Design a protein around this ligand. Structure first.
Ligand SMILES: CCOc1ccc2ccc(-c3nn(CC4CCNCC4)c4ncnc(N)c34)cc2c1
Length: 454
């Protein structure tokens, strides 16, 4: 008797989109235990290993235990999906918490990096490599100031192939070890990624940077970086030495995780130190830029999904409309909405028939029934979560409350989003015919619609 995920768990709400799938906050129907479930769609994500290889890795991961590593509880599989059930953490992404503080010292950085290295060392002892370590995979356990870091996604990348879509790729290039680019890699790739993260904590800029993804990858692959930025003048020698050893090009010459834990810098600063004010400022700029580019990509995707699902839904209902009345009942709206969830594959949110009944009932309570009006409301439902996140992200990036984003800023944003320069300028030309060389929110939004075939 294979076991079924929704026999045990009900969905509370969506937490977000992470690597390889959606993550939903769920609750055990019997014990009331809350968990975070990552749902991997087989249609969207190809496997790299056989089933046997994956089952044994899962079995090992369920037994591992370390305070800086996400705890995995269960694994389920059906026809369309894999369901990975882990512990929920509520403190959010590390960098989002850091930009909220007024001071940040080498002691704060050292304490963070010790945690990361400790998790990594443990996982490497157990022969598991992350490969895709980056700031998004570092979660704080709770919203308290002290809270431990929990690393998510250890072990995934070995069994599943990453998306080639930019909306899923944002940020990845800064942190990937050069040997991963060329194909021969081992556990030392995780030390490199940590080194890049450390460099960024102490300066607020990527050691390997550029105007688009490929430019970044080119800097990484050559492997040269410098400490010639002004803000490095305030930083201890021992920190730069540890950095150097983690960013050592040839993996066999690069320091191990375990030895980095013993480095003088970790020893000194984790047991007369200024705030790194310039680094906090750079980090909040870095962060805001990354989050706005992500928000702009998800908005464009959400718009295209809606164009696709609106027309599909209408044709399902038209077919269903026996009498040509333009009128369906509740059971019919439910069966058509279900039909949409079968064809499509988008709503981890609609785990079972019961979540679909509730969603239908929410739309009805807002709005025999005219199906064309039901279609209108059901779809806005799914967007504005992305339209209002767009707006939130624009306001967060406009830190001066100017209401405006300059041409230069757009060039940075679209570069990170990997939208071609002559393409966005062309779209900007069609909206900015006053030559202001700056845009307000509504103008920015209009550009994005034009960049996704609207
Ligand atoms: C082998 C490791 O693979 C797995 C398996 C299960 C997971 C469950 C949740 C999550 C996981 N992902 N997220 C959501 C993301 C939203 C925005 N970006 C960062 C976090 C969580 N939020 C809170 N608590 C969690 N446990 C998770 C990741 C998993 C990874």
């Amino acid at each position: 008797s294979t076991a079924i995920f929704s026999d045990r768990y009900k969905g509370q709400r969506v937490l977000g989109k992470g690597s390889f799938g959606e993550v939903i906050l769920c609750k055990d129907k019997i014990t009331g235990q809350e968990c975070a479930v990552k749902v991997i769609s087989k249609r969207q994500v190809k496997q790299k290993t056989d089933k046997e290889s994956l089952l044994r890795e899962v079995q090992l991961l369920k037994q591992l235990d370390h305070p800086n590593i996400m705890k995995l509880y269960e694994f389920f599989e059906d026809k369309g999906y894999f369901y990975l059930v882990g512990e929920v953490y509520t403190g959010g992404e590390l960098f989002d918490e850091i930009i909220s503080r007024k001071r940040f010292s080498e002691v704060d950085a050292a304490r963070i990096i010790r945690q990361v290295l400790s998790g990594i060392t443990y996982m490497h002892k157990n022969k598991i490599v992350h490969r895709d370590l980056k700031p998004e995979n570092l979660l704080l356990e709770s919203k308290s100031k002290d809270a431990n870091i929990r690393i998510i996604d250890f072990g995934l990348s070995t069994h599943f192939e990453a998306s080639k879509k930019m909306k899923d790729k944002i940020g990845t290039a800064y942190y990937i070890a050069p040997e991963v680019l060329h194909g021969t890699y081992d556990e030392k790739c995780d030390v490199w990624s940590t080194g890049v993260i450390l460099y960024i904590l102490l300066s607020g800029c990527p050691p390997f940077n550029g105007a688009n993804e490929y430019d970044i990858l080119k800097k990484v692959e050559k492997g040269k970086y410098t400490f010639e930025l002004p803000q490095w003048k305030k930083v201890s020698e021992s920190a730069k030495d540890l950095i150097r050893k983690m960013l050592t090009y040839v993996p066999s010459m690069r320091i191990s995780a375990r030895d980095a834990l013993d480095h003088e810098w970790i020893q000194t600063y984790t047991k007369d130190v200024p705030s790194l004010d310039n680094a906090i400022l750079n980090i909040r700029q870095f962060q805001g830029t990354q989050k706005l580019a992500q928000a702009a990509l998800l908005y464009m995707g959400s718009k295209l999904t809606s164009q696709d699902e609106t027309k599909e839904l209408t044709a399902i209902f038209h077919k269903m409309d026996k009498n040509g009345d333009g009128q369906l009942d509740r059971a019919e709206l439910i069966e058509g909405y279900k039909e949409l969830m079968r064809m499509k594959g988008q709503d981890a949110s609609m785990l079972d028939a019961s979540a679909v009944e509730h969603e239908v009932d929410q739309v009805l309570d807002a709005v025999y029934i005219e199906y064309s009006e039901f279609v209108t409301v059901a779809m806005d439902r799914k967007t504005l979560l992305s339209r209002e996140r767009l707006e939130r992200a624009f306001r967060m990036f406009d830190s001066d409350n100017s209401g405006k984003i300059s041409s230069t800023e757009l060039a940075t944003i679209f570069g990170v989003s990997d939208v071609d320069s002559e393409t966005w300028k062309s779209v900007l030309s069609e909206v900015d015919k006053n030559n202001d060389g700056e845009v307000d929110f509504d103008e920015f939004q209009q550009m994005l619609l034009k960049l996704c075939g609207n």
